[PDB]
Design a protein around this ligand. Sequence first.
Ligand SMILES: CCCCCCCCCCCCCCCC(=O)O
Ligand SMILES: CCCCCCCCCCCCCCCC(=O)O
Ligand SMILES: [Fe+3]
Ligand SMILES: [Fe+3]
Ligand SMILES: [Fe+3]
Ligand SMILES: [Fe+3]
Lengths: 285, 285
Amino acid sequence: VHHDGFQTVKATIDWEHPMFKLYEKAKRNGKWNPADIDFSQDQKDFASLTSEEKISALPLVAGFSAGEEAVTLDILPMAHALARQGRLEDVLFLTTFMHDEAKHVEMFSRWQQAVGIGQMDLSVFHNDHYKRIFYEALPEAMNRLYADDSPEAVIRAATVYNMIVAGTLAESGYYTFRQIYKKAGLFPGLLQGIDYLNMDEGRHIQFGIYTIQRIVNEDERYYELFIRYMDELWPHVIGYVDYLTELGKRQQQLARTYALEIDYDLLRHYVIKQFNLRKKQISRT
Amino acid sequence: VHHDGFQTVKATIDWEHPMFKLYEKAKRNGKWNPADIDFSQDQKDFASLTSEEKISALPLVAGFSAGEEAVTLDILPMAHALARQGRLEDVLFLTTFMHDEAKHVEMFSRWQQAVGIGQMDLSVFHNDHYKRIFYEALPEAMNRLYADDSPEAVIRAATVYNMIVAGTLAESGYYTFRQIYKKAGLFPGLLQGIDYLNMDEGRHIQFGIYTIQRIVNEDERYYELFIRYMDELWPHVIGYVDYLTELGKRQQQLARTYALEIDYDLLRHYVIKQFNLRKKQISRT
Ligand SMILES: CCCCCCCCCCCCCCCC(=O)O
Ligand SMILES: CCCCCCCCCCCCCCCC(=O)O
Ligand SMILES: [Fe+3]
Ligand SMILES: [Fe+3]
Ligand SMILES: [Fe+3]
Ligand SMILES: [Fe+3]
């Protein structure tokens, strides 16, 4: 379907638009290249580990690698729906969002290659709860936007990505990675990558907040919908946390060896503090 | 529609894939930031010009600003269709393609702002030929790919963007800009931007070639279709060149003042040499 004009021909970019200023920040803080990370110490770290120590890390990497790959694939219809609405500055920023996520895919995959598990299918650490979120709910809500770009649809997609997948699971995964492998002194390259990812992530979450708020600002029913969709997914969020927790408890070798007082009941509550504060971040007026 | 697995969980990125290697090159050669370009000399250059000298440059800027904006908006469905086919490395690269184009939009718009024409609607330098290409044929062929991602559809979209809009009009516009304002010593910031754009453009065109060839490599009927779609658009390509040419001839002030032996019958043939060599770039086997 045709264009009925071009904003930068009729006029200019809206230089004061929040998403244009988020875009400017993204060019300035998003120059990191996964190809420049040195994973060699990570290769030795992983080899030194016993088989059962090796398993300790793989479930978390598996959730991240599918997660990054899913968001790289699924964000495209959201960028397209905002394009079609003529929200040019949103689109400019989303280009950085998408390049970020592609770097995220690349980072974890280079790590898997370098530590020697590239040939290994980590699909087995995705339980049904995880599948529900990443294999189903994320692509469903995003792809919807081809045929139905209503505020209700935009709210739902922004919630699924920005406030659950990223704002809850991803952020908790950054925290879990530090609480564990930063302490044991393991996987320096991976944790460098995690740092970069966490910095990128702040812009991603801010885009989701800006999106969700601007729709709630029109009509407050949409605050209710926001919350309803958050809560509708929480059981699958926590069912995946419990699944991963029950895995670390039954594979204590890495914690024992590297003398980690690994507190799963605290990671868990961090997930809850993340989920609840994402709700807080959306003002109802 | 769901995911049936993730490549970087089952396996890894295909590190030897051409589009992964194009992606690596894009991160390394695509760090330029339009916000760092100094347009101040351009502001003085544009002010010094007489009204009729001012008009000389605006038609070319108008075609570029709509063009960049159009490709930023319209490439999204191609990235989505390749995502859905599971061509992960294509998608990784397309993220750089899209960020590039967003920088392209930004560059020309910052220039318009800085030289003082942001408030001016340059839609009047788009004739019906130009509209046919950029307002209609480009979004049509790209958007098709939501519902019809057949090789015939992918060939057509890659041809419209990579071998006409970019491979013919954009490249000739880089050449026209040097032949004119590089000679007169005008608009240093703009021409810096044009240089960067031209470097980016080489990856864009290579993606279109790789796309078109990989489909022709299956079945040779698609070489015929490639050519048929090129030629089907040429009348609108040249009708826009003639339109812009007939404008420079009737506004000789800028050429007279800055003593430019501006040869439109040579720019024109450059357009023809660009169009014909894009055809050459697609081997039929
Ligand atoms: C045992 C405590 C569990 C801690 C929670 C760990 C969750 C793993 C994270 C995987 C999901 C990654 C989603 C990426 C989102 C993005 O790229 O924006
Ligand atoms: C008088 C001689 C005419 C010379 C031809 C000039 C054509 C102007 C270019 C405008 C189209 C720009 C398309 C951008 C494509 C891209 O960003 O890949
Ligand atoms: Fe990410
Ligand atoms: Fe993210
Ligand atoms: Fe461009
Ligand atoms: Fe281009």
